[PDB]
Amino acid sequence: SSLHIAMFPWFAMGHLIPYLHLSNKLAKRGHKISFFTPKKTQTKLEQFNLYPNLITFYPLNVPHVDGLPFGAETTSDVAISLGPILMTAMDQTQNQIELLLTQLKPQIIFFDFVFWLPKITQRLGIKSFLYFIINPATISYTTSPPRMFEAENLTEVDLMKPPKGYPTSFNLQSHEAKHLASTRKIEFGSGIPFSVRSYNCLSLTDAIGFKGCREIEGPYVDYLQEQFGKPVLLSGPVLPEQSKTALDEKWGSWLGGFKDGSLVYCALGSELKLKQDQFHELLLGLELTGFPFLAILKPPVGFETIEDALPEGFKERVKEKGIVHSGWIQQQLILEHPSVGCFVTHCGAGSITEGLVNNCQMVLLPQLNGDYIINARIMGRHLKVGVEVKKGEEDGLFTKESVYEAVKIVMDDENEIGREVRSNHTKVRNLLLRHDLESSCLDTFCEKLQELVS
Ligand SMILES: O=c1c(O[C@@H]2O[C@H](CO)[C@@H](O)[C@H](O)[C@H]2O)c(-c2ccc(O)c(O)c2)oc2cc(O)cc(O)c12
Ligand SMILES: O=c1ccn([C@@H]2O[C@H](COP(=O)(O)OP(=O)(O)O)[C@@H](O)[C@H]2O)c(=O)[nH]1
């Protein structure tokens, strides 16, 4: 029997897009989807609704919070430092969520971040489902019960080792463990420390789910089910669905001018701005390779245009071999273009999936975020599908030479490390795209959802 599922993702394109990819897959199986989205953002999402008779968008008015820029709805609209104010705004949609649930009466609601929701759904006889599109390895590492019980006694040294029972081994750098130790405590919406918020969600929800498959995410989902004692489901890897919009002719034309697999595509998602010095090092490092390149970057902190921030003489030198562009582009369609030989990625979970299912060599440039870093270690050290750019142990900065080196290694047909990561990427791609992998993930996913509402 088909389920009625409401979708309430965090106000970020990296959550809205995979929630919508999964919504399409569920609607293909006959499930009805009530998709809650920020009002103005809906227009940018219609692109991905492949089943409009089963997936209905319901607009939310993102309420004012002092300090929130006017009209902002998504982390793509605000600086990263304003994230916590946008969380307060999510929290403030509770009254219009409460009334949406009372009239739509879904059986289940998928959600991010809003730990006040499972109390409302329990009142309404709705099952609450905390659905993560970040890596379960990340939540396991930072937000499992052993971490939370040390409360404010958790130090950087504590975060250099995994919590008790963690299924896997990888190494963080000092500046990374410092980042996790401090940001953990910072308020993220309505006065709630960041890790406490996610821990409240994990503790109060009826069930948990993650993007992923047993073959990769399995050990972390098993750890989390053991720790929190409730079902932790896998949706499958949320393979991107095809958009209703073809590749912009202007990019298709320009990309088509380059030899197959010769171009380096670099993008760091839609939420982040580099500091100027690392903006310069990254671009000079791309230039040093001599390969054509497309870099999708916001102007660095303090700057409003790409032009103003470019290293001196850069435009005149790179000529028509390189473009630095700050607008939103069709990343999934660009990564499929045969010109792209290399993807320099900030290791956002969505970008990771989009690179893995394509042929591009992966260069890992994780930005300062627990999920990006943990994704980069898993991809670089466990799956060994990419080469990570070296950062300073204490300062977290990279040189132009380290960018150049990583791209040169993966692009060199005769380099054994490049051949190794190509071979391992092929293995992972063949797994993720296996004819029965995503479908059997979704088979199990939907049976366990049926169990949840039983
Ligand atoms: O990145 C994390 C994360 O998602 C992101 O939180 C950033 C803010 O810090 C946002 O700006 C990005 O839009 C969001 O994708 C989340 C998160 C995502 C969805 C949830 O429903 C949830 O409860 C936690 O948790 C983390 C926990 C960590 O210990 C370390 C992390 O890096 C994250
Ligand atoms: O200019 C852009 C930037 C991002 N994306 C898409 O936005 C999502 C970004 O998710 P990810 O988790 O990689 O990074 P974030 O932007 O949240 O840091 C992915 O589906 C990308 O393909 C896009 O289409 N165009």
Short mmCIF file of C-alpha atoms and ligand atoms in Angstrom, two decimals:
data_model
loop_
_atom_site.label_atom_id
_atom_site.label_comp_id
_atom_site.label_asym_id
_atom_site.label_seq_id
_atom_site.Cartn_x
_atom_site.Cartn_y
_atom_site.Cartn_z
CA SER A 1 0.00 0.00 0.00
CA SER A 2 1.32 3.45 -0.90
CA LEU A 3 2.52 5.82 1.81
CA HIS A 4 1.92 9.53 2.24
CA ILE A 5 5.27 11.08 3.20
CA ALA A 6 5.95 14.71 4.00
CA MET A 7 9.43 16.09 3.31
CA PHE A 8 10.84 18.86 5.55
CA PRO A 9 14.54 19.34 4.64
CA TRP A 10 16.87 22.00 5.99
CA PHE A 11 16.88 25.25 3.99
CA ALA A 12 19.89 24.45 1.81
CA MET A 13 20.20 23.33 -1.79
CA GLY A 14 22.41 20.40 -0.70
CA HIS A 15 19.44 19.08 1.27
CA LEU A 16 16.58 20.15 -0.99
CA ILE A 17 18.10 18.52 -4.08
CA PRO A 18 18.75 14.98 -2.68
CA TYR A 19 15.42 15.08 -0.81
CA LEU A 20 13.85 15.75 -4.21
CA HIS A 21 15.89 13.05 -5.99
CA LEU A 22 14.63 10.56 -3.38
CA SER A 23 11.06 11.94 -3.58
CA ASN A 24 11.06 11.13 -7.30
CA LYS A 25 12.19 7.55 -6.61
CA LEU A 26 9.49 7.08 -3.99
CA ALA A 27 6.82 8.56 -6.24
CA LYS A 28 7.88 6.15 -8.99
CA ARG A 29 6.93 3.41 -6.51
CA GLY A 30 3.49 5.02 -6.05
CA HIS A 31 4.08 6.97 -2.83
CA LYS A 32 2.51 10.39 -2.41
CA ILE A 33 4.95 13.14 -1.39
CA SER A 34 4.11 16.43 0.34
CA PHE A 35 7.28 18.48 -0.18
CA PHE A 36 7.65 21.49 2.15
CA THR A 37 9.92 24.17 0.65
CA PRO A 38 10.72 27.86 1.19
CA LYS A 39 8.28 29.87 -0.93
CA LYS A 40 10.56 31.61 -3.46
CA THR A 41 12.86 28.57 -3.65
CA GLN A 42 10.04 26.42 -5.06
CA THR A 43 10.56 27.88 -8.57
CA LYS A 44 14.18 26.64 -8.65
CA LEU A 45 12.96 23.17 -7.57
CA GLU A 46 10.24 22.54 -10.19
CA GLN A 47 13.11 21.46 -12.48
CA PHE A 48 13.51 18.25 -10.52
CA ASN A 49 9.87 17.27 -9.92
CA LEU A 50 9.44 14.39 -12.35
CA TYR A 51 6.06 13.29 -10.87
CA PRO A 52 3.96 16.43 -10.31
CA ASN A 53 0.77 14.39 -9.79
CA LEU A 54 2.33 12.65 -6.75
CA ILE A 55 4.85 15.25 -5.51
CA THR A 56 3.14 18.47 -4.40
CA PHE A 57 5.14 21.47 -3.20
CA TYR A 58 3.82 23.33 -0.15
CA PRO A 59 5.39 26.76 0.41
CA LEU A 60 6.77 27.92 3.74
CA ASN A 61 7.24 31.59 4.52
CA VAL A 62 10.72 31.88 6.02
CA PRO A 63 10.03 34.20 8.97
CA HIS A 64 12.04 37.22 9.99
CA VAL A 65 14.74 36.81 12.61
CA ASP A 66 16.77 39.84 13.58
CA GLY A 67 19.93 39.77 11.48
CA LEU A 68 18.51 37.61 8.72
CA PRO A 69 18.94 39.41 5.38
CA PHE A 70 15.61 40.36 3.86
CA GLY A 71 13.99 37.65 1.76
CA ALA A 72 16.65 35.03 2.49
CA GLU A 73 15.42 31.44 2.36
CA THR A 74 18.45 29.12 1.89
CA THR A 75 22.10 28.87 2.91
CA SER A 76 22.76 29.76 -0.74
CA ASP A 77 21.36 33.23 0.12
CA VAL A 78 23.41 33.98 3.25
CA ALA A 79 26.97 33.86 4.47
CA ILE A 80 27.97 30.81 6.49
CA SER A 81 28.14 32.89 9.68
CA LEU A 82 24.38 33.55 9.35
CA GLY A 83 23.50 29.84 9.36
CA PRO A 84 22.40 29.89 13.01
CA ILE A 85 19.95 32.73 12.35
CA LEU A 86 18.47 30.76 9.45
CA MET A 87 18.08 27.82 11.85
CA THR A 88 16.14 30.08 14.22
CA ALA A 89 13.92 30.90 11.22
CA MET A 90 13.34 27.19 10.51
CA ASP A 91 12.45 26.74 14.16
CA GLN A 92 9.93 29.56 13.73
CA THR A 93 8.02 27.73 10.98
CA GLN A 94 6.61 25.42 13.68
CA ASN A 95 3.14 26.95 13.64
CA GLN A 96 2.83 26.72 9.89
CA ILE A 97 4.28 23.18 9.96
CA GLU A 98 1.79 22.18 12.65
CA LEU A 99 -1.10 23.34 10.50
CA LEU A 100 0.30 21.73 7.35
CA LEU A 101 0.52 18.35 9.09
CA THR A 102 -2.92 18.63 10.64
CA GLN A 103 -4.55 19.11 7.24
CA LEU A 104 -2.36 16.88 5.04
CA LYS A 105 -2.07 14.05 7.62
CA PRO A 106 0.96 12.22 6.17
CA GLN A 107 1.89 8.88 7.68
CA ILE A 108 5.57 9.91 8.05
CA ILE A 109 7.56 13.13 7.87
CA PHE A 110 11.22 13.18 6.83
CA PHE A 111 13.03 16.06 8.53
CA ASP A 112 16.32 17.82 9.36
CA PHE A 113 17.35 19.63 12.53
CA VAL A 114 13.92 20.49 14.11
CA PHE A 115 13.99 18.41 17.30
CA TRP A 116 10.66 19.92 18.42
CA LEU A 117 8.89 18.05 15.62
CA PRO A 118 8.61 14.46 17.00
CA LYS A 119 6.51 15.79 19.90
CA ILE A 120 4.04 17.26 17.40
CA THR A 121 3.94 14.18 15.19
CA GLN A 122 3.47 11.85 18.16
CA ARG A 123 0.43 13.93 19.11
CA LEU A 124 -0.92 13.61 15.56
CA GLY A 125 -0.15 9.90 15.14
CA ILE A 126 2.54 10.69 12.52
CA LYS A 127 5.89 8.89 12.57
CA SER A 128 8.95 11.14 12.67
CA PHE A 129 11.91 10.20 10.46
CA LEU A 130 15.20 12.05 10.79
CA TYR A 131 16.66 11.75 7.26
CA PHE A 132 20.34 12.71 6.76
CA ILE A 133 21.98 13.35 3.40
CA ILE A 134 25.37 13.78 5.12
CA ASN A 135 27.65 10.82 5.88
CA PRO A 136 26.58 8.54 8.78
CA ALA A 137 30.31 8.39 9.52
CA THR A 138 30.10 12.06 10.46
CA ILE A 139 27.14 11.77 12.85
CA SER A 140 28.77 8.64 14.34
CA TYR A 141 32.01 10.48 14.96
CA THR A 142 30.64 13.66 16.57
CA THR A 143 27.11 13.04 17.86
CA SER A 144 27.06 9.47 19.19
CA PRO A 145 26.16 9.18 22.91
CA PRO A 146 29.76 8.75 24.15
CA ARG A 147 30.64 12.16 22.71
CA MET A 148 27.58 13.86 24.20
CA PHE A 149 28.08 12.57 27.75
CA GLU A 150 31.46 14.27 28.00
CA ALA A 151 29.41 17.50 27.55
CA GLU A 152 31.75 20.54 27.75
CA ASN A 153 34.69 18.32 28.80
CA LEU A 154 35.14 17.26 25.14
CA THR A 155 38.49 18.67 23.90
CA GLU A 156 40.40 18.81 20.63
CA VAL A 157 42.47 15.86 21.87
CA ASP A 158 39.24 13.95 22.49
CA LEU A 159 38.16 14.59 18.91
CA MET A 160 41.46 13.29 17.50
CA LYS A 161 40.29 9.75 18.28
CA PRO A 162 36.96 8.12 17.37
CA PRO A 163 34.32 7.58 20.07
CA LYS A 164 34.09 4.21 21.79
CA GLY A 165 32.87 1.46 19.47
CA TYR A 166 33.43 3.45 16.25
CA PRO A 167 33.78 0.87 13.44
CA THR A 168 36.55 2.51 11.43
CA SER A 169 39.94 4.26 11.66
CA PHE A 170 41.03 7.52 10.05
CA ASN A 171 43.21 10.46 11.03
CA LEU A 172 42.22 14.08 11.57
CA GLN A 173 44.67 16.96 11.54
CA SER A 174 45.08 19.15 14.62
CA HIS A 175 43.28 22.14 13.11
CA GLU A 176 40.37 19.87 12.15
CA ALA A 177 39.92 18.47 15.64
CA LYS A 178 40.13 22.05 16.99
CA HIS A 179 37.39 23.05 14.56
CA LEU A 180 35.12 20.22 15.68
CA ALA A 181 35.83 20.85 19.37
CA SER A 182 34.87 24.53 19.16
CA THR A 183 32.03 24.66 16.59
CA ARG A 184 30.24 21.81 18.37
CA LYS A 185 29.37 24.26 21.20
CA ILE A 186 28.29 27.24 19.09
CA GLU A 187 24.58 28.00 19.12
CA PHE A 188 22.84 26.90 15.91
CA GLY A 189 19.33 28.33 16.10
CA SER A 190 17.14 29.35 19.04
CA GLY A 191 19.93 29.15 21.58
CA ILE A 192 20.74 25.45 21.07
CA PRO A 193 24.38 24.30 20.75
CA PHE A 194 24.96 22.66 17.38
CA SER A 195 25.71 19.11 18.49
CA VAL A 196 23.00 19.20 21.18
CA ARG A 197 20.45 20.02 18.46
CA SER A 198 21.37 17.00 16.34
CA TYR A 199 21.57 14.80 19.40
CA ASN A 200 18.08 15.94 20.44
CA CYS A 201 16.87 14.96 16.94
CA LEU A 202 18.53 11.53 17.08
CA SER A 203 17.15 10.91 20.60
CA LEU A 204 13.52 12.01 20.07
CA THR A 205 12.75 10.82 16.52
CA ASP A 206 10.93 7.54 15.91
CA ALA A 207 13.47 6.34 13.34
CA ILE A 208 16.58 7.55 11.50
CA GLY A 209 17.69 7.28 7.88
CA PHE A 210 20.72 8.13 5.77
CA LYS A 211 21.63 8.43 2.15
CA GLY A 212 23.92 5.47 1.41
CA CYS A 213 24.27 1.74 0.82
CA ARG A 214 25.35 -1.19 3.00
CA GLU A 215 28.57 -1.64 1.05
CA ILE A 216 29.91 1.77 2.12
CA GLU A 217 27.75 3.38 4.82
CA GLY A 218 26.78 0.03 6.42
CA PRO A 219 29.21 0.00 9.38
CA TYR A 220 28.20 3.49 10.53
CA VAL A 221 24.46 2.84 10.29
CA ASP A 222 25.03 -0.38 12.28
CA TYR A 223 26.96 1.55 14.94
CA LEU A 224 24.22 4.19 15.18
CA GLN A 225 21.44 1.59 15.43
CA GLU A 226 23.33 -0.13 18.25
CA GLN A 227 23.91 3.19 20.03
CA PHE A 228 20.48 4.79 19.71
CA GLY A 229 18.46 1.54 19.79
CA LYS A 230 16.01 2.47 17.01
CA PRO A 231 15.95 1.73 13.28
CA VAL A 232 18.62 3.46 11.22
CA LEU A 233 17.63 3.01 7.59
CA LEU A 234 19.52 3.39 4.29
CA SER A 235 17.73 5.01 1.33
CA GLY A 236 20.29 3.88 -1.18
CA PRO A 237 22.90 6.28 -2.59
CA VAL A 238 20.31 8.76 -4.02
CA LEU A 239 21.61 8.54 -7.57
CA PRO A 240 20.88 11.90 -9.23
CA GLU A 241 17.79 11.90 -11.43
CA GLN A 242 17.65 13.57 -14.83
CA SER A 243 16.54 17.19 -14.90
CA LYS A 244 13.87 18.51 -17.24
CA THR A 245 16.34 21.25 -18.32
CA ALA A 246 19.10 20.49 -20.83
CA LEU A 247 22.68 21.76 -20.42
CA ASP A 248 22.87 25.52 -21.02
CA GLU A 249 24.03 25.98 -24.61
CA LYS A 250 26.68 28.47 -23.51
CA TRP A 251 28.46 25.92 -21.31
CA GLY A 252 27.84 23.01 -23.68
CA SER A 253 29.41 24.99 -26.52
CA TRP A 254 32.48 26.05 -24.52
CA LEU A 255 33.07 22.64 -22.92
CA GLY A 256 32.73 21.03 -26.37
CA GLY A 257 35.78 22.93 -27.58
CA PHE A 258 38.14 20.84 -25.42
CA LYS A 259 39.66 17.41 -25.94
CA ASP A 260 37.92 14.54 -24.15
CA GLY A 261 38.94 14.28 -20.48
CA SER A 262 41.31 17.25 -20.64
CA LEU A 263 39.38 19.81 -18.52
CA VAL A 264 39.60 20.30 -14.74
CA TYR A 265 36.27 21.19 -13.12
CA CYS A 266 36.51 22.80 -9.68
CA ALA A 267 33.56 23.72 -7.47
CA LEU A 268 33.06 24.14 -3.73
CA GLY A 269 29.25 23.98 -3.50
CA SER A 270 26.91 26.91 -2.99
CA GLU A 271 27.37 27.83 0.68
CA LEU A 272 31.01 28.86 1.02
CA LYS A 273 33.38 31.71 0.21
CA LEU A 274 37.15 31.20 0.30
CA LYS A 275 39.46 33.72 1.92
CA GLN A 276 41.40 35.67 -0.69
CA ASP A 277 44.76 34.01 -0.10
CA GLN A 278 43.39 30.48 -0.59
CA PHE A 279 41.32 31.72 -3.55
CA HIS A 280 44.60 32.87 -5.10
CA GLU A 281 46.47 29.66 -4.27
CA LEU A 282 43.70 27.49 -5.70
CA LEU A 283 43.46 29.42 -8.98
CA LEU A 284 47.22 29.70 -9.46
CA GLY A 285 47.44 25.96 -8.78
CA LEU A 286 44.91 25.22 -11.50
CA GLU A 287 46.86 27.50 -13.84
CA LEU A 288 50.14 25.71 -13.07
CA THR A 289 48.71 22.43 -14.39
CA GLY A 290 48.33 23.88 -17.88
CA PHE A 291 45.03 22.05 -18.30
CA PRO A 292 41.85 23.87 -19.31
CA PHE A 293 39.70 24.49 -16.26
CA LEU A 294 36.31 25.70 -15.07
CA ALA A 295 36.21 26.99 -11.47
CA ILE A 296 32.78 27.67 -9.95
CA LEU A 297 33.59 29.89 -6.98
CA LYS A 298 32.06 32.77 -5.07
CA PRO A 299 34.23 35.89 -4.83
CA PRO A 300 36.44 35.61 -1.74
CA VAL A 301 35.67 37.18 1.61
CA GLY A 302 35.75 40.96 1.31
CA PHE A 303 35.26 40.95 -2.47
CA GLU A 304 32.10 41.32 -4.57
CA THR A 305 33.32 40.28 -8.05
CA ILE A 306 35.58 37.53 -9.37
CA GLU A 307 37.38 40.13 -11.54
CA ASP A 308 38.56 42.20 -8.58
CA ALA A 309 39.87 39.16 -6.69
CA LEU A 310 41.79 37.39 -9.46
CA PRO A 311 45.59 37.23 -9.10
CA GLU A 312 47.40 39.94 -11.04
CA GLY A 313 47.71 39.11 -14.75
CA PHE A 314 45.65 35.91 -14.34
CA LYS A 315 43.01 36.69 -17.01
CA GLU A 316 45.63 37.72 -19.56
CA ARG A 317 47.63 34.56 -18.95
CA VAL A 318 44.93 31.90 -18.92
CA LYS A 319 43.12 33.46 -21.94
CA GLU A 320 40.43 31.03 -23.21
CA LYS A 321 41.77 27.94 -21.39
CA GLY A 322 40.20 28.86 -18.05
CA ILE A 323 37.00 30.38 -16.69
CA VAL A 324 36.29 31.43 -13.10
CA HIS A 325 32.53 31.86 -12.67
CA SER A 326 30.43 32.73 -9.60
CA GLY A 327 26.88 31.92 -10.77
CA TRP A 328 24.84 28.77 -10.13
CA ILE A 329 25.46 26.21 -12.89
CA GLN A 330 24.14 22.74 -13.79
CA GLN A 331 26.90 20.85 -11.99
CA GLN A 332 25.48 17.37 -12.55
CA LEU A 333 25.26 18.00 -16.29
CA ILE A 334 28.77 19.46 -16.41
CA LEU A 335 30.27 16.48 -14.57
CA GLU A 336 28.74 14.24 -17.26
CA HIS A 337 30.36 16.17 -20.10
CA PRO A 338 33.15 14.16 -21.78
CA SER A 339 35.57 17.10 -21.57
CA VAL A 340 35.80 16.82 -17.78
CA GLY A 341 38.82 14.76 -16.74
CA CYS A 342 39.19 15.95 -13.14
CA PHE A 343 36.83 17.16 -10.38
CA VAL A 344 38.40 19.27 -7.62
CA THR A 345 35.69 19.04 -4.98
CA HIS A 346 35.02 20.46 -1.51
CA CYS A 347 33.70 16.96 -0.64
CA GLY A 348 30.09 17.94 -0.05
CA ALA A 349 28.09 14.73 0.07
CA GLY A 350 26.09 15.65 -3.04
CA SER A 351 29.13 16.54 -5.11
CA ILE A 352 30.81 13.31 -3.94
CA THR A 353 27.93 11.23 -5.31
CA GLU A 354 27.91 13.19 -8.57
CA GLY A 355 31.65 12.66 -9.06
CA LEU A 356 31.57 8.98 -8.12
CA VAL A 357 28.91 8.11 -10.72
CA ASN A 358 30.96 9.81 -13.46
CA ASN A 359 34.38 9.19 -14.98
CA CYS A 360 36.29 12.25 -13.64
CA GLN A 361 39.37 11.75 -11.49
CA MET A 362 38.64 13.03 -7.96
CA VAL A 363 40.86 15.63 -6.25
CA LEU A 364 39.76 16.18 -2.66
CA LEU A 365 39.81 19.76 -1.28
CA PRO A 366 37.55 19.43 1.77
CA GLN A 367 36.54 22.71 3.31
CA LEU A 368 36.36 23.28 7.05
CA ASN A 369 33.29 21.23 7.94
CA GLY A 370 33.09 17.86 9.70
CA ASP A 371 31.18 16.13 6.90
CA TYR A 372 33.52 17.42 4.17
CA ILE A 373 36.61 16.34 6.11
CA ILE A 374 35.28 12.89 6.98
CA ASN A 375 34.07 12.42 3.39
CA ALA A 376 37.58 13.35 2.22
CA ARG A 377 39.30 10.83 4.53
CA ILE A 378 36.91 8.03 3.56
CA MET A 379 37.28 8.82 -0.13
CA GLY A 380 41.05 9.27 0.04
CA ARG A 381 42.05 6.57 2.54
CA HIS A 382 39.29 3.92 2.60
CA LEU A 383 37.74 3.85 -0.87
CA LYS A 384 40.98 5.39 -2.27
CA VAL A 385 39.06 6.95 -5.16
CA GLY A 386 40.76 10.35 -5.02
CA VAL A 387 43.88 12.28 -4.01
CA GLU A 388 43.58 14.84 -1.21
CA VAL A 389 45.35 18.19 -1.39
CA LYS A 390 47.73 18.58 1.56
CA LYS A 391 46.83 21.20 4.23
CA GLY A 392 49.06 22.59 6.96
CA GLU A 393 48.68 20.53 10.13
CA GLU A 394 47.95 23.54 12.36
CA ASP A 395 46.93 26.31 9.93
CA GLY A 396 44.63 24.34 7.58
CA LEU A 397 45.98 26.17 4.50
CA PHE A 398 47.18 24.74 1.19
CA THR A 399 49.77 25.93 -1.32
CA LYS A 400 49.33 26.38 -5.05
CA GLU A 401 51.98 23.66 -5.48
CA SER A 402 49.88 21.13 -3.54
CA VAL A 403 46.86 21.84 -5.75
CA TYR A 404 49.01 21.51 -8.85
CA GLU A 405 50.55 18.27 -7.59
CA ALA A 406 47.26 16.52 -6.83
CA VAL A 407 45.72 17.39 -10.19
CA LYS A 408 48.91 16.47 -12.05
CA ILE A 409 48.99 13.06 -10.33
CA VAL A 410 45.44 12.09 -11.23
CA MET A 411 45.64 13.51 -14.77
CA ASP A 412 48.92 11.70 -15.64
CA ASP A 413 48.03 8.49 -17.49
CA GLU A 414 51.43 7.07 -16.52
CA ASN A 415 51.25 7.91 -12.80
CA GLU A 416 50.60 4.78 -10.74
CA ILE A 417 48.72 6.61 -7.99
CA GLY A 418 46.51 8.21 -10.65
CA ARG A 419 45.95 4.79 -12.21
CA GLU A 420 45.11 3.34 -8.78
CA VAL A 421 42.49 5.95 -7.92
CA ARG A 422 40.98 5.64 -11.41
CA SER A 423 40.69 1.88 -10.93
CA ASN A 424 39.17 2.22 -7.45
CA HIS A 425 36.77 4.93 -8.65
CA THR A 426 35.67 2.57 -11.42
CA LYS A 427 34.98 -0.14 -8.82
CA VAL A 428 32.87 2.20 -6.68
CA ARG A 429 31.03 3.56 -9.74
CA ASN A 430 30.25 0.02 -10.92
CA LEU A 431 28.87 -0.71 -7.44
CA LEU A 432 26.73 2.42 -7.12
CA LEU A 433 25.34 2.00 -10.66
CA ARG A 434 24.86 -1.78 -10.41
CA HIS A 435 21.50 -2.62 -11.98
CA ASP A 436 20.03 -3.86 -8.66
CA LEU A 437 21.92 -1.80 -6.07
CA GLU A 438 19.76 1.30 -5.68
CA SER A 439 16.54 -0.61 -6.34
CA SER A 440 17.24 -3.24 -3.67
CA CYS A 441 18.23 -0.46 -1.25
CA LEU A 442 14.87 1.18 -1.91
CA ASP A 443 13.09 -2.19 -1.61
CA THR A 444 14.42 -2.62 1.92
CA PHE A 445 13.93 1.11 2.68
CA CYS A 446 10.25 0.98 1.79
CA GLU A 447 9.62 -2.27 3.71
CA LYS A 448 11.17 -0.71 6.81
CA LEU A 449 9.06 2.44 6.35
CA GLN A 450 5.99 0.21 6.12
CA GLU A 451 7.08 -1.45 9.36
CA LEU A 452 7.43 2.00 10.94
CA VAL A 453 3.81 2.96 10.21
CA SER A 454 2.51 -0.51 11.10
O1 LIG B 1 27.69 19.43 8.18
C1 LIG B 1 26.98 18.95 9.09
C2 LIG B 1 25.60 18.87 8.96
O2 LIG B 1 24.99 19.44 7.86
C3 LIG B 1 25.36 20.79 7.55
O3 LIG B 1 25.36 21.64 8.69
C4 LIG B 1 25.90 22.95 8.37
C5 LIG B 1 25.99 23.74 9.66
O4 LIG B 1 27.10 23.35 10.44
C6 LIG B 1 25.01 23.63 7.35
O5 LIG B 1 25.61 24.88 7.01
C7 LIG B 1 24.85 22.76 6.11
O6 LIG B 1 23.87 23.35 5.25
C8 LIG B 1 24.44 21.33 6.47
O7 LIG B 1 24.50 20.46 5.34
C9 LIG B 1 24.84 18.31 9.97
C10 LIG B 1 23.39 18.07 9.98
C11 LIG B 1 22.65 17.95 8.80
C12 LIG B 1 21.29 17.66 8.84
C13 LIG B 1 20.66 17.44 10.05
O8 LIG B 1 19.34 17.12 10.12
C14 LIG B 1 21.40 17.51 11.24
O9 LIG B 1 20.77 17.29 12.43
C15 LIG B 1 22.75 17.79 11.19
O10 LIG B 1 25.45 17.78 11.07
C16 LIG B 1 26.79 17.85 11.27
C17 LIG B 1 27.26 17.33 12.46
C18 LIG B 1 28.63 17.39 12.67
O11 LIG B 1 29.12 16.92 13.83
C19 LIG B 1 29.51 17.94 11.72
C20 LIG B 1 29.00 18.45 10.54
O12 LIG B 1 29.84 18.98 9.63
C21 LIG B 1 27.61 18.42 10.29
O1 LIG B 2 26.56 26.05 -8.83
C1 LIG B 2 26.15 25.01 -8.32
C2 LIG B 2 26.49 24.54 -7.00
C3 LIG B 2 25.96 23.39 -6.56
N1 LIG B 2 25.12 22.62 -7.33
C4 LIG B 2 24.50 21.39 -6.80
O2 LIG B 2 24.16 21.66 -5.46
C5 LIG B 2 24.41 20.49 -4.64
C6 LIG B 2 25.49 20.86 -3.67
O3 LIG B 2 25.51 19.83 -2.69
P1 LIG B 2 26.86 19.50 -1.92
O4 LIG B 2 26.46 18.66 -0.76
O5 LIG B 2 27.88 18.95 -2.87
O6 LIG B 2 27.43 20.94 -1.48
P2 LIG B 2 26.92 22.31 -0.76
O7 LIG B 2 26.58 23.27 -1.88
O8 LIG B 2 25.74 21.98 0.12
O9 LIG B 2 28.14 22.74 0.04
C7 LIG B 2 24.80 19.38 -5.62
O10 LIG B 2 23.67 18.60 -6.00
C8 LIG B 2 25.42 20.17 -6.78
O11 LIG B 2 25.33 19.51 -8.02
C9 LIG B 2 24.74 23.01 -8.60
O12 LIG B 2 23.99 22.34 -9.29
N2 LIG B 2 25.30 24.18 -9.03
#
